[PDB]
Design an enzyme around this catalytic site. Structure first.
Site, PDB file in Angstrom:
ATOM      1  N   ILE A  55      39.670  40.820  23.654  1.00 31.70           N
ATOM      2  CA  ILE A  55      40.707  39.852  24.001  1.00 31.70           C
ATOM      3  C   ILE A  55      41.029  39.833  25.486  1.00 31.70           C
ATOM      4  O   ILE A  55      41.702  38.894  25.943  1.00 31.70           O
ATOM      5  CB  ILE A  55      41.997  40.091  23.190  1.00 31.70           C
ATOM      6  CG1 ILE A  55      42.595  41.458  23.528  1.00 31.70           C
ATOM      7  CG2 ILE A  55      41.719  39.976  21.701  1.00 31.70           C
ATOM      8  CD1 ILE A  55      43.963  41.693  22.927  1.00 31.70           C
ATOM      9  N   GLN A  79      39.227  43.452  36.083  1.00 31.96           N
ATOM     10  CA  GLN A  79      38.249  43.931  37.054  1.00 31.96           C
ATOM     11  C   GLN A  79      37.777  45.339  36.715  1.00 31.96           C
ATOM     12  O   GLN A  79      36.585  45.647  36.825  1.00 31.96           O
ATOM     13  CB  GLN A  79      38.841  43.890  38.463  1.00 31.96           C
ATOM     14  CG  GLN A  79      37.841  44.214  39.562  1.00 31.96           C
ATOM     15  CD  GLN A  79      38.479  44.263  40.936  1.00 31.96           C
ATOM     16  OE1 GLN A  79      39.686  44.072  41.080  1.00 31.96           O
ATOM     17  NE2 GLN A  79      37.667  44.520  41.955  1.00 31.96           N
ATOM     18  N   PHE A  80      38.699  46.209  36.299  1.00 37.06           N
ATOM     19  CA  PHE A  80      38.369  47.585  35.965  1.00 37.06           C
ATOM     20  C   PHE A  80      38.551  47.932  34.496  1.00 37.06           C
ATOM     21  O   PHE A  80      37.808  48.780  33.989  1.00 37.06           O
ATOM     22  CB  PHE A  80      39.216  48.558  36.803  1.00 37.06           C
ATOM     23  CG  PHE A  80      39.114  48.328  38.283  1.00 37.06           C
ATOM     24  CD1 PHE A  80      37.881  48.313  38.911  1.00 37.06           C
ATOM     25  CD2 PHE A  80      40.253  48.133  39.046  1.00 37.06           C
ATOM     26  CE1 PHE A  80      37.783  48.105  40.274  1.00 37.06           C
ATOM     27  CE2 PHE A  80      40.161  47.923  40.409  1.00 37.06           C
ATOM     28  CZ  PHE A  80      38.925  47.910  41.024  1.00 37.06           C
ATOM     29  N   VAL A  95      40.636  44.772  27.613  1.00 38.63           N
ATOM     30  CA  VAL A  95      41.672  44.767  26.588  1.00 38.63           C
ATOM     31  C   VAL A  95      41.065  44.258  25.289  1.00 38.63           C
ATOM     32  O   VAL A  95      40.396  43.217  25.273  1.00 38.63           O
ATOM     33  CB  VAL A  95      42.876  43.904  27.006  1.00 38.63           C
ATOM     34  CG1 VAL A  95      44.023  44.081  26.021  1.00 38.63           C
ATOM     35  CG2 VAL A  95      43.316  44.259  28.417  1.00 38.63           C
ATOM     36  N   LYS A 112      42.974  49.633  25.590  1.00 39.73           N
ATOM     37  CA  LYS A 112      42.711  49.380  27.006  1.00 39.73           C
ATOM     38  C   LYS A 112      41.738  50.448  27.498  1.00 39.73           C
ATOM     39  O   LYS A 112      42.125  51.603  27.705  1.00 39.73           O
ATOM     40  CB  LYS A 112      44.010  49.387  27.807  1.00 39.73           C
ATOM     41  CG  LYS A 112      43.953  48.589  29.098  1.00 39.73           C
ATOM     42  CD  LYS A 112      45.353  48.293  29.612  1.00 39.73           C
ATOM     43  CE  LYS A 112      45.335  47.227  30.695  1.00 39.73           C
ATOM     44  NZ  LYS A 112      46.711  46.822  31.091  1.00 39.73           N
ATOM     45  N   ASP A 119      53.762  44.015  37.654  1.00 41.41           N
ATOM     46  CA  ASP A 119      53.035  42.917  37.022  1.00 41.41           C
ATOM     47  C   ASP A 119      53.954  42.104  36.121  1.00 41.41           C
ATOM     48  O   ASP A 119      53.586  41.740  34.999  1.00 41.41           O
ATOM     49  CB  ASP A 119      51.830  43.436  36.237  1.00 41.41           C
ATOM     50  CG  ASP A 119      50.620  42.532  36.368  1.00 41.41           C
ATOM     51  OD1 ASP A 119      50.321  42.096  37.500  1.00 41.41           O
ATOM     52  OD2 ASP A 119      49.967  42.257  35.340  1.00 41.41           O
TER      53      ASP A 119
END
Ligand code: A1ISP
EC number: 2.7.11.34
Lengths: 1132, 280, 381
Positions: B18, B22-23, B26, B41, B139
């Site tokens: 989903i 970049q690293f 999910v 994650k 975030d």
């Protein structure tokens, strides 16, 4: 490491079996008895019961019965032990050596089996061909009776019936038929078989099963001519012969189940019944039917005879006398007169055998004499509650007390011809001798004209030939009876003085200076027939008549002041009869020839406390019999008075030492008197068979007690005794009792019979406000307070309804000036399985009343209460709890400890705590006052039932567990790892053969230092459900090593009844495992080493290496064992 | 293996992917011990961050472990397996805040004022939770503000993706347009607790006008900095939103972090205001 | 409650019926034995209980295949602390039902195991293949004669067999423990250590949790009834360990009867304060009781306790039949409100006719018994 030693201070007293037959020979009526291991065969005679023999049974007896085979002129006996050791006896007497030799013996236990629920039942074939035993369920053990099977070799018959309540062999059958009632889900049925040896199995019986009363209990095989079998239940009785069937419904049997039965007629025309309560029922069978000369039943009338003691095994002795064997009462002997009907009873009691069991709780105390224990116990059950105040001694009750300034001499005088009763008791002061007139209560000092007054009396008494001799240290002024004139006065030719005036029944020989001469009391005169002198001065002169003749003394033994030896010589001569090596330094104090049991004895009581017990020869010569039993450590005197148709010679000393022989060996029943210096019998008209206790404080007169080993008192309570504790300051006892009260339709409960609680002088009922059907029984618990002198119940305290009292403690707590009676109740309800609200209540006896000056409420049920160094340690439910008695008189909890087990037992020493539950979960806790909290050291867990526990010392813990065993526990202090420090090692295994209820610390002897200490350390006593009060005391490593190495050497010579070994008898018993007894010493076996014969004592010791005092001395003679073994017997 | 429970890969069954950063990536999946939907994650720390950077990341993750609030995504477990730090959270598949913002944009209907305060107070409570425990978000955006069908707001993506991107500040210009940049972050002055409320103010304006405060067509990162520094954004309508709505966003969207008030001031305003329109 | 409680015992959720074995294997008491150990078993297996296993590792399937031709007995180490594989006691379990299925090209076996004997482990060795072999010293099951045996009169022995049960139970104490007047202890105390009375009090509580009858289901043997209660007790790992070391069943019944009394409240094992359910809300859905061991589609059990009402749970997911352990029942997953652990599921009845409608399915491995008020948890005997 325990290295213990167990002895029996009182043999079991409650019986578990009683039969009748002709055991000794054909023409005897024996009444065999077995209490627990004491098979006491009797012989019934019109005079009563005459004891014959008692034997050492190595096992717990459960089956006993007299059976006479064919070809045998006297009854034999069947002996089967609770350890399943089976032996069949045979009485035999060869002149005097009454030996109960054994015909057959052996073990009849099998490898695997679950012991039955109704226990063990053993019955014999009336034709004497079968031994019927039901040991395990679903299996019948039968053994053929014959000469070939002398080992009791057994064969088994599988039973397809699990439950079997009571099985009996049948009368009048061609082959042995057994009739038993047994429970099944369908109901209770009575079924039979025909056991046969040819096919080694069972066979069809004479009839089928029957539906019978729902509580049928036992069979009673009625003998011929009726035959068949009678079955008694809780509701009705029935007769089962096949075609015939009779049953009556008696309304007076409904009270209690009928337990014990007995046949009082050889043809079965009568039977004797007894219930749990112990009342007597007369079952009669009527042969009124007569078809053509043959007779059968018509009715089964049942009569009520009377109330006996709670019965276990009944027995009919001839002329209507029955031995009502008991276990929790007093064994009786009652005449069943058939015309008495005095109040509704055909029973009147004649005898009573004192019974110590069941002992529940006891306290070793000192009622009267300091330094000696007189154990008090709680005994009886239900209506037979009583106290067994054991004392080790034979005291005297002084009926008179006249102050005398150190009476130095007393002797009876009779200045009244044709009296046959004591009249005068002349005293002897330091330089005077008062003569007193004493016929009734007269104590006036009346001096006769025929006797002087300014002299020291040494011999004032009565002789034949109408002459009364009052011999003083100056001269023998012989007086008369009717004229009371000085017929003659034999004076010393050189005006010398006799050291002691010795005389006989018809001769007087004094020791004047260093010479001894005999001066018989000639008829109306006085003359001397001999004159001689010894090498040394005669410190002790003893010329007393022997048996027979009664006119002369064949032999006289004397003591030499400069030699301290027994000098025996002829009376009319000077030839030395014998000389004794024993004796030195301190001169002998008194010498006498003793005729105990028609056996000549002579104990040389010295002035320092040594009594060289020995014998004598009346005809010629003398023996040595080297034996010196210390009769004190003070100057003594040997005076003999009969008063009992026997010798009964007692040597007065600072402690009163009595010289009595049981049968032929002297038993020093150390008497109970203050300090006896000189002894003289006061056989006055008002003092029949009495005596005059002449002491240095006050001259007393009275009657001494019997010559008994342990005089046991008894006071009736008529309610169950539970616990007891001694309180010294209040001069009383405290006892917990439970009288059964009947729940009627009144909202209360009426007492069944008057009891101690009901008839106490003062009663109190608890009124605590801090929180049924008709005919039911409810226990009411009480704290009774009883004085130590008269044992009168002074206060009965009534607890709350449905309140149970579990723990008793008497102590003084914290910092108060008055001691307290503290009991912990435990309210238990039938709905509530585990109680949830106990109590702790404070009592303090003062001014004749028991009051609750303090009270504590708890949430649970208290089980054990000790005093932990000024603070009370009550274990509530399963939380061993401490307290601190405060200044406001209210218990305050200080520390708690919650247990993985149920804290049932509590034993504390110093600052340690011992905890145990009912299943041998022994716990050890240490208190740390530097933290204020409890702790744990070691924790040993084992699944087994445990009766009571007691701590021996700081390391050793002792308890009594299931299967009649004793065990000790010990925690090693050298545990290098705490895992071992958390474990209680066990080193004690022993089959006591009994079931302890209580342990107590103390002894029943006079506590003696002995200078060099004693072999034993500590003194703990344990009671039992039968009454076997014993003693186990720790020993040294080398003491226990000697005793153990010679106890094993005893059993290789001394033989038992049944050839039962001691190793098997004493070994650890569990339902799953057996282990040899280690770390314990049997004192009853060890004490029995004395009575063994002399040539066997040579085989006992041959490589013993006894001595450890700088040299083994491997020979160790024979007396070295008698040096130690006799020393051991003094602890009880 | 139930012994560690939520703390192993063998217990979990992966369904699909989903998310893909970049690293980190999910996923939505479940566990064959309970089947609870979760948010896995997965990141590869061995290839992206040195040993020192892992200690701070682990320590910060431990702070989020204590974060337990209904309005915040619950932390199930964090562990390392197959050289990957696997983190499992509460899955919110019903959508995010930006979904309805686009939906109302398609409808071309302004979101009612009473509706805006209904869930903004719930987000303020979530922001209060980690700000009270000295934890920052970095975030905060409508993308990681999820709502179920019950109307309950959860705040997810607690800066885990931004912790691994601290060494790639220049890489923020190639993957999306960071419309929520704070003045202290672009100037490389470091992140503070005033950056979360700055994004919240930008979030609050976006929820009303359905657009970013510094939005621009064919607008480059240099132009984004100038608008952020000048705080030049179109004014919110007064007929649809009251003064308190417009005044609240004025303080949060400020170049000076010191001027911006605390979360308690915003949360207290959130509680008082929302109650007014609840009965209106 | 129309669930036909026999269904969970049949284990119809594992597919086709397993191959049954008739032979019974027993080791001698106190004997020194060597037994295999299942690497992935963490349940405290009380003997007298059947434990079903599904094996996925090839070594586990290889291990059972060797045992299939052998005595079919393996140990179940009761790991007091599971992290370091430390075990001090254990249980020897026999295998009587097994079935091998070649699912998806791999050999998967589903096996039912029955525990027989408790034992003490002396050494924990691991072979080169990774399979654990344990030194065995069997604890002897101590059998105790009645507490009135040694103090019973041989004459009164004929009244010790017997033919409103309260009046009958009152008449059972006064005729078996009548000899309590010889010893120092009262009548009622002696019953507390008697097997035939403890099982009565245990049956009283169980009837509050099940509507079955004691005569058929609940056994009569004190040894059997001791293990039967312990297995079906909703207790944690620690409280079930002490019930494995106890040797005499007389102690075990008193301990369990105390476990069932004090532990009136239950909490999660990761919270020790968040109440989840109680003992009164427990109701039975299997002949094994409310507690019945089920295995998850990947060799993972889930002892489950069905209660009417449970609290402090947040519902996650949607009702899916998937592998519904209760036939006909979907479920909704729930987790702990505080510690985010997996407590259990909430089952819902898809058919309205059948009963019950809603009942919570809680795994045992996440529930902690706890005395109310504030005191330490102590279990006498
Ligand atoms: C195998 C794939 N499954 C599905 C995709 C993964 C997740 C989400 C839906 C479903 N799933 C489950 C995960 C674990 C379990 C179950 C489903 C399930 O049913 N159980 C127990 C408890 C309920 C019951 O009564 N019986 C069971 O077997 C689980 O353990």
């Amino acid at each position: 490491m325990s290295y213990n030693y167990v002895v029996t201070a009182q043999k079991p007293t409650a019986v578990n079996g009683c039969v009748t037959g002709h055991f000794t020979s054909a023409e005897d009526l024996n009444l065999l008895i077995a209490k627990n291991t004491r098979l006491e065969i009797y012989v019934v005679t019109a005079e009563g019961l005459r004891p014959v023999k008692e034997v050492g049974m190595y096992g717990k007896i459960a089956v006993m019965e007299l059976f006479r085979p064919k070809g045998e002129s006297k009854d034999l006996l069947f002996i089967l032990t609770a350890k399943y050791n089976a032996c069949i006896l045979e009485y035999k007497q060869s002149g005097e050596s009454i030996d109960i030799i054994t015909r057959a013996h052996g073990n009849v236990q099998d490898r695997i089996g679950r012991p039955s629920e109704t226990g063990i039942i053993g019955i014999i074939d009336p034709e004497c061909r079968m031994i019927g035993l039901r040991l395990y369920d679903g299996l019948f053990k039968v053994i053929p009776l014959d000469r070939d099977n002398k080992e009791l070799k057994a064969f088994n018959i599988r039973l397809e019936e699990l439950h079997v309540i009571d099985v009996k062999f049948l009368y009048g059958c061609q082959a042995p038929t057994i009739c038993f009632v047994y429970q099944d889900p369908q109901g209770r049925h009575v079924k039979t078989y025909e056991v046969s040896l040819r096919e080694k199995e069972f066979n069809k019986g004479p009839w089928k099963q029957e539906n019978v009363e729902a509580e049928a209990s036992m069979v009673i095989a009625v003998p011929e001519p009726f035959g068949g079998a009678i079955i008694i239940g809780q509701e009705s009785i029935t007769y089962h012969n096949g075609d015939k069937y009779l049953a009556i419904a008696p309304p007076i049997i409904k009270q209690s189940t009928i337990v014990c039965h007995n046949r009082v007629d050889p043809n079965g025309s009568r039977y004797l019944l007894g219930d749990m309560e112990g009342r007597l029922f007369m079952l009669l069978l009527e042969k009124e039917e007569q078809m053509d000369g043959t007779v059968t039943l018509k009715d089964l009338r049942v009569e009520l005879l009377g109330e006996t003691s709670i019965a276990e095994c009944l027995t009919y002795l001839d002329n209507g006398v029955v031995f009502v064997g008991s276990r929790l009462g007093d064994s009786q002997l009652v005449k069943l007169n058939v015309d008495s009907n005095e109040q509704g009873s055909y029973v009147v009691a004649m005898e009573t055998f004192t019974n110590l069991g069941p002992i529940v709780d006891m306290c070793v105390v000192d009622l009267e004499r300091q330094g000696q224990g007189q154990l008090v116990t709680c005994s009886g059950a239900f209506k037979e509650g009583s106290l067994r105040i054991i004392r080790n001694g034979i005291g005297i009750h002084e009926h008179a007390s006249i102050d005398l300034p150190g009476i130095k001499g007393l002797w009876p005088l009779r200045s009244d011809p044709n009296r046959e009763t004591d009249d005068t008791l002349v005293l002897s002061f330091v330089g005077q001798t008062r003569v007193l007139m004493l016929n009734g209560e007269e104590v006036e000092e009346t001096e006769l004209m025929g006797f002087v007054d300014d002299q020291q009396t040494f011999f004032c008494g009565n002789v034949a030939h109408q002459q009364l001799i009052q011999i003083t240290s100056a001269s023998v002024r012989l007086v008369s009876q009717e004229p009371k004139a000085l017929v003659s006065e034999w004076k010393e030719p050189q005006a010398k003085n006799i050291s002691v005036a010795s005389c006989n029944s018809s001769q007087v020989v004094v020791a004047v200076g260093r010479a001894l001469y005999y001066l018989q009391i000639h008829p109306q005169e006085l003359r001397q027939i001999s004159h001689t002198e010894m090498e040394h001065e005669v410190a002790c002169l003893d010329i007393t008549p022997l048996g027979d003749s009664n006119g002369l003394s064949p032999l006289c033994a004397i003591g030499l002041w400069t030699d301290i030896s027994a000098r025996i010589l002829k009376l009319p001569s000077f030839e030395l009869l014998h000389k004794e090596m024993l004796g030195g330094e301190i001169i002998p104090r008194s010498i006498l020839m003793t005729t105990f049991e028609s056996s000549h004895y002579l104990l040389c009581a010295l002035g320092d406390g040594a009594l060289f017990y020995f014998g004598l020869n009346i005809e010629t010569g003398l023996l040595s019999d080297r034996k010196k039993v210390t009769l004190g450590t003070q100057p003594t005197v040997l005076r003999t008075f009969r008063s009992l148709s026997t010798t009964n010679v007692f040597a007065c000393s600072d402690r009163p030492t009595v010289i009595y022989s049981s049968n032929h060996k002297l038993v020093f029943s150390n008497v109970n008197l203050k300090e006896v210096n000189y002894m003289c019998p006061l056989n006055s008209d008002g003092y029949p068979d009495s005596l005059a206790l002449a002491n240095n404080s006050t001259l007393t007169i009275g009657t001494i007690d019997e010559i008994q080993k342990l005089h046991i008192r008894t006071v009736p309570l008529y309610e169950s005794p539970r616990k007891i504790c001694y309180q010294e300051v209040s001069q009383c006892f405290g006892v917990l009792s439970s009288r059964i009260e009947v729940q009627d339709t009144s909202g209360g409960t009426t007492a069944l019979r008057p009891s101690a609680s009901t008839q106490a002088l003062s009663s109190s009922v608890s009124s605590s406000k801090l929180f049924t059907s008709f005919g039911e029984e409810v226990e009411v618990h009480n704290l009774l307070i009883i004085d130590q002198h008269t044992f009168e119940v002074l206060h009965a305290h009534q607890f709350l309804q449905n309140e149970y009292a579990l723990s008793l403690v008497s102590c003084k707590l914290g910092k108060d000036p008055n001691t307290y009676f503290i009991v912990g109740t435990a309210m238990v309800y039938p709905e509530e399985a585990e109680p949830k609200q106990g109590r702790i209540v404070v009592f303090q006896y003062s001014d004749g009343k028991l009051q609750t000056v303090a009270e504590k409420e708890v949430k649970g049920a208290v089980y054990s209460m000790v005093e932990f160094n000024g603070k009370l340690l009550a274990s509530i439910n399963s939380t061993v709890r401490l307290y601190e008695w405060t200044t406001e008189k209210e218990l305050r909890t200080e520390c708690n400890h919650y247990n993985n087990i149920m804290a049932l037992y509590l034993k504390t020493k110093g600052d340690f705590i011992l905890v145990g539950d009912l299943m041998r979960s022994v716990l050890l806790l240490a208190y740390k006052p530097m933290e204020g909290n409890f702790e744990e050291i070691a924790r040993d867990f084992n699944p087994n039932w445990m009766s009571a526990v007691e701590i021996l010392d700081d390391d050793n813990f002792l308890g009594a567990e299931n299967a009649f065993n004793l065990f000790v526990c010990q925690k090693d202090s050298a545990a290098t790892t705490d895992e071992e420090r958390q474990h209680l090692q066990e080193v004690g295994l022993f089959h006591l053969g009994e079931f302890v209820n209580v342990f107590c610390h103390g002894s029943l002897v006079m506590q003696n230092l002995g200078e060099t200490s004693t072999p034993t350390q500590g003194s703990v006593l344990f009671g039992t459900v039968n009454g076997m009060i014993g003693l186990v005391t720790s020993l040294s490593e080398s003491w226990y090593n000697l005793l153990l190495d010679m106890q094993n050497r005893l059993n290789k010579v001394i033989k038992s009844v049944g050839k039962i070994e001691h190793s098997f008898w004493r070994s650890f018993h569990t339902e799953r495992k057996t282990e040899p007894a280690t770390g314990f010493i049997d004192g009853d076996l060890i004490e029995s080493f004395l009575d063994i014969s002399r040539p066997k004592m040579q085989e006992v010791v041959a490589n013993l290496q006894y001595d450890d005092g700088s040299g083994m001395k491997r020979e160790a003679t024979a007396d070295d064992l008698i040096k130690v073994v006799e020393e051991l017997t003094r602890i009880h | 293996r139930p012994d560690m429970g939520y703390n192993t890969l063998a217990n979990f069954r992966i369904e699909k992917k989903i998310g893909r950063g970049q690293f980190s990536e999910v996923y939505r999946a479940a566990c064959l011990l309970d089947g609870v939907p979760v948010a896995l994650k997965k990141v590869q720390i061995f290839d992206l961050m040195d040993a020192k950077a892992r200690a701070d990341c682990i320590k910060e993750i431990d702070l989020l472990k204590q974060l337990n609030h209904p309005n915040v995504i619950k932390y199930y477990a964090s562990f390392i397996e197959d050289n990957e730090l696997n983190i499992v959270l509460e899955l919110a598949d019903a959508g995010d805040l930006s979904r309805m913002i686009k939906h109302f944009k398609k409808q071309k209907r302004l979101i009612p004022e009473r509706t805006v305060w209904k869930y903004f107070v719930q987000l303020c409570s979530a922001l209060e939770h980690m700000h009270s425990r000295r934890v920052m978000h970095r975030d905060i955006k409508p993308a990681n503000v999820f709502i179920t069908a019950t109307g309950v707001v959860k705040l997810g993506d607690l800066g885990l993706g931004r912790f691994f991107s601290s060494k790639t500040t220049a890489a923020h210009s190639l993957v999306g347009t960071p419309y929520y940049m704070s003045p202290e972050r672009i100037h490389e002055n470091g992140y503070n607790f005033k950056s979360d409320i700055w994004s919240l103010g930008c979030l609050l304006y976006e929820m009303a006008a359905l657009q970013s405060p510094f939005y621009g067509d064919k607008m480059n990162l240099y132009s984004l900095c100038k608008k952020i520094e000048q705080c030049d954004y179109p004014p919110l309508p007064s007929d649809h939103y009251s003064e308190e709505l417009r005044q609240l966003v004025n303080m949060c969207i400020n170049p000076d972090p010191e001027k911006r008030p605390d979360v308690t001031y915003v949360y207290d305003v959130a509680k008082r205001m929302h109650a007014c329109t609840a009965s209106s | 409650i129309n669930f036909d409680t026999s269904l969970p015992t049949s284990h119809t959720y594992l597919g086709a019926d397993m191959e049954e074995f008739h032979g019974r294997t027993l080791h001698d008491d106190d004997s020194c034995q060597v037994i295999p150990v299942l690497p992935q078993v963490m349940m405290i297996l009380i003997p007298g209980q059947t434990l079903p296993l599904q094996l996925f590792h090839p070594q586990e399937v290889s291990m059972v295949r060797n045992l299939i031709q052998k005595d079919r007995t393996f140990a179940v180490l009761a790991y007091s602390n599971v992290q370091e594989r430390e075990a001090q006691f254990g249980t020897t379990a026999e295998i009587y039902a097994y079935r091998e299925e070649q699912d998806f090209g791999i050999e998967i076996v589903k096996v039912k195991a029955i525990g027989r004997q408790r034992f003490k482990v002396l050494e924990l060795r691991t072979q080169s293949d990774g399979i654990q072999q344990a030194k065995v010293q069997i604890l002897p099951e101590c059998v105790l004669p009645s507490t009135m045996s040694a103090v019973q009169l041989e004459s009164l022995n004929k009244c010790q067999i017997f033919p409103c049960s309260y009046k009958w139970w009152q008449k059972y104490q006064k005729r078996k423990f009548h000899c309590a007047n010889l010893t120092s202890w009262p009548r009622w105390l002696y019953s507390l250590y008697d097997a035939e009375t403890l099982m009565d009090r245990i049956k009283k509580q169980l009837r509050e949790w099940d509507e079955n009858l004691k005569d058929d289901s609940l056994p009569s043997n004190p040894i059997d009834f001791s293990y039967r209660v312990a297995a079906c007790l909703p207790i944690d790992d620690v409280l079930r360990i002490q019930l494995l070391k106890i040797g005499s069943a007389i102690q075990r019944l008193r301990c369990e009867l105390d476990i069932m009394n004090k532990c009136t409240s239950l909490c999660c094992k990761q919270c020790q304060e968040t109440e989840i359910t109680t003992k009164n809300e427990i109701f039975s859905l299997s002949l094994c009781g409310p507690m019945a061991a089920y295995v998850n589609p990947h060799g993972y059990v889930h002892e489950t306790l069905t209660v009417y009402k449970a609290c402090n749970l947040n519902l996650i997911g949607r009702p899916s039949t998937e592998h519904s352990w209760f036939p006909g029942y979907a479920w909704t997953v729930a987790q702990c409100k505080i510690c985010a652990s997996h407590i259990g599921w909430k089952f819902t009845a898809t058919k309205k006719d059948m009963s019950p409608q809603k009942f919570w399915g809680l795994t045992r491995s996440a529930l902690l018994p706890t005395i109310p008020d504030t005191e330490d948890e102590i279990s006498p005997d």
